[PDB]
């Protein structure tokens, strides 16, 4: 055998007088896949069938199971469990998010910010669209490598202290990196008014290069890096 | 339903709920970067606090700088205790200064990989101790 | 597109590099000129500095405006108090120098 | 009852699904000015098309020069002549237009020297209708073409007043006298129930790969749309035909793309032989999925596997330039490491034929409209459509050709919209609804929420899956299948004996994964019975006891003075499965494949022929 302990955050909105508490579980790792999600699933199916959490791809490419495992925001389907048993894997939901239940935090705001940047191709003349393919050199395309892959796991933006204290008005990395992604997409024609949308104290400028965001990203992406890049466009673009 | 309207619904819904807030500072991993920006704030705040008291007492207090030093002098001053005080002045000045440079490199878009942060972050601590110990004996 | 928030950013960096450039230039060349610009750069930088901390942690309209003002007083008082000290006393450069010999 | 508040909504259209088919349908409706809802149990991005990697086929003639009719031919061959040729014409013609549309939407395709979309080779594709060698029409976004596809569309989706019900689990259709009036659905968050009613409905829920113990599919691929149709008393089609994708990690099941093979990747068995050349000489393992996985899965049966128990085959990449692996296959490069601990640049991957695509589904026109089968004839269920992996126009028939299903989505999603646009108008009388409508689904809900039996949902699911794994594998035979059948039938009986533990209203995944199981059984039931009755080797369905391909004529021989077989004596026809809810008893009829195209002068009805790549 081989027991590993999991200490996991819990909360039920349908059990009056309940309040945020942790609960431990114990798992023979010989009968369990390597990844943390495997565990949370294995405990759901075998042990406790109350535990509530988000999941789908189990392949680390969809962003459903984002959560704080041992003080760092990642995908549970990609973090392999700590084979060392003296340690007890702690699991919490993503930080400073209103918890709907257990490990299921409310992202509607997160998405709504994603909405607020207009993530799609914009052209001045959309009269010839949907008929010819737009041209883009491989060099112009390469500028998106490192940006286009963003899962929307939201591990980053929810690790940024600026976004903890300013979820309402600050956009956060996830989204800004994508705003940037459209800025330097050659095909797009609205690069300036995209930049114009960020001319306020908060939208962009609550970044203070804390760099927690890039640290925790599940896909090795570098938002901070992209924020910086934005700020440089912001100061040197003309009109 | 627009982006603004969604955001509005979120807050109405959640403020008037009985949902908890997920924890943050309590659970989150301590990183050198984290600590190294916290400090940069703290240091900032202490220096301006320092500059303020200095310019303010210039207008509020009696005498002149000489009189206030001659006051200091007559406090059976230890040469170590002077060094201490003098190191205490210049420790956060130099930290913030060196780290400030690192911030300014970043704003030039430079050196934002998890390698480079641990490297530069470490250098700043080294440059800090050296210039601090250096100046505190000039 | 009034670049009002982005110009504020640029300015911050601009003064920060000045203040980097002043510390050593002052050591090399202590003089009235330097003692004032030191005063200018210090206070301004620290004002915008704290500015941020405030706009980061101080929530709601009334309160922020209030702190923002009470900050501005402090900053104004501070610039004056320094300029004064430069004019009617030793001046920053030399004040430090003396303080150091101690 | 009355523990649940019901909240009625009114709309011009409901699209159930937010995967490329769902998205595309959804907003194409709105674009046409229809007050349109979109019910998806997951956040759109979280859907499966994200997971897709290979590409999306369309003869743009970017690499070489190309003809969509060569695409048609390749597709309809691929279908093993169970694929309905009108819908395949429609698609392959449209594919250029549909892809270009996605690029003008923003999707960042990989580019060429010419700065056009980079297309590449994929399993089963050719030029000059099979004569002119290998073809290169799989348009791709390096290795993450589903991801991009989805987020591009999702992004676009936001540019319209489409009303997205996120994390809302559709329960049943709102049928009334053969006519669909929308959907009733759980609202996962507060637990309340919502009767979304509308003049048309579109069902775009994707597959049921979770009927099996091993699949590339996600945890949410539960055949929910398929099941809802079933409980309307409506037929599903060809659900026995299941695609076993040749590759996919031995352990977890994660897919490694056929783009690996299309970019020059090779398959090796335990004695080192480039073994797929021995089976098919001209394809050499760029062949159809049915054939390649057959080769693989048969080579382990011998005892010639490559692992600690000798149970999987090796997928090689290391002989391809390192730079190539980075540009063309970074996504798979990374998950190969993560799940197997395997570097792709100097080690081969461990792969195993595993469930991947359901070319079965809800029966359809080429116009997206759902079909019933009355009087041995086709009849359009009014106010109900479907598109993507959920539906079965059988654009794929017996075998999905690679990199066509992402095209399937976009093409038919689009069509469903166009087809409603042209037939009715926004604002038109949104049909009424009896006050007690769909109570039974609520009682089903209540039943499962407080359900107190002896078996846990998880354990029953497990059994269903291992059952379908044993008996509905790549190869199957009456004996096995017979056992398999009554096996799935008894588990449908065990739905009385199921313990549900969680009892909350908010985010009760215990109950919804349970619902998901009802849906998955219904699907499993129809899959296995259909399979046992079908006595031929067509496409992905291979009977060892009936290894002959059973058409109306022996097409091996030239026809002419041949005596044609009567409809109920050959197997070139669509399996139409039903099931009586209560007994969990499968009944099933048949309906003919369509061979005529939309225009003979533009595209030639490709007649049946010999099957081998
Ligand atoms: C690993 C993998 C790789 C693939 N690669 C390729 C490729 O390279 N090229 C290619 O052409 N094809 C590929 N495919 C096939 C293709 O991805 C699928 O056929 C396609 O994603 C199906 O799209 P869809 O919108 O029909 O369903 P999905 O994309 O699966 O989406 C289903 C939608 O329906 C919703 N839904 C489900 N149940 C309910 C319910 N009860 N109530 C409300 N909503 C519900 C979901 O929330 C979701 O939004 C791949 C498949 C897999 C698994
Ligand atoms: C060469 C000297 C200095 C340099 C180069 C410098 C640089 C900087 C920079 C770049 C920042 C912004 C950090 C960010 O990007 O978010 C900053 C913040 C700050 N600095 Fe300085 N600084 C210097 C000296 C000082 C001095 C002497 C004081 C006070 C007397 C001071 C007080 C502050 C304060 C209060 C802040 C705000 C802290 C924050 O927002 O995190 N600095 N400094
Ligand atoms: C332990 C203690 C010192 C109380 C602590 C821990 C963590 C934080 C979080 N960091 C911060 O609040 C912080 C730190 C430096 C710069 C900017 C910020 C920002 F305002 F943007 F968030 C702040 C303070
Ligand atoms: S950036 Fe990295 S972390 Fe932030 S969302 Fe996209 S993926 Fe998840
Ligand atoms: S974690 Fe936060 S403050 Fe800026 S660079 Fe990173 S976003
Ligand atoms: S569940 Fe899909 S990212 Fe882990």
Coordinates of C-alpha atoms in Angstrom, one line a residue, chain A residues 165-166 168-169 192 196 199-200 202 205-206 208 234-237 239, chain C residues 1-7 9-10 51-53 55-57 59 64:
Chain A
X165 CA -7.4 44.0 -4.4
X166 CA -8.8 45.3 -7.7
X168 CA -13.5 45.1 -10.3
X169 CA -11.5 47.7 -12.3
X192 CA -4.8 52.0 -31.6
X196 CA -7.0 53.7 -26.3
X199 CA -6.1 54.9 -20.8
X200 CA -7.2 54.9 -17.2
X202 CA -6.8 50.7 -13.5
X205 CA -1.9 50.4 -15.0
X206 CA -2.5 48.4 -11.8
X208 CA 3.3 46.8 -10.8
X234 CA 0.9 52.7 -24.7
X235 CA 3.6 55.4 -24.3
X236 CA 4.9 55.5 -27.8
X237 CA 1.8 55.1 -30.0
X239 CA -2.7 60.1 -31.8
Chain C
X1 CA -7.5 59.7 -27.2
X2 CA -6.0 62.0 -24.5
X3 CA -2.9 60.0 -23.5
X4 CA -3.5 61.1 -19.9
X5 CA -2.8 57.9 -17.9
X6 CA 0.0 56.8 -20.2
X7 CA 1.8 60.2 -20.0
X9 CA 3.4 56.5 -16.4
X10 CA 6.1 57.8 -18.7
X51 CA -0.1 58.1 -5.1
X52 CA 0.0 54.5 -6.4
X53 CA -0.2 52.8 -3.0
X55 CA -4.9 54.2 -5.6
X56 CA -4.0 50.5 -5.0
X57 CA -5.5 50.2 -1.4
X59 CA -11.3 52.1 -2.0
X64 CA -9.6 58.2 -2.2

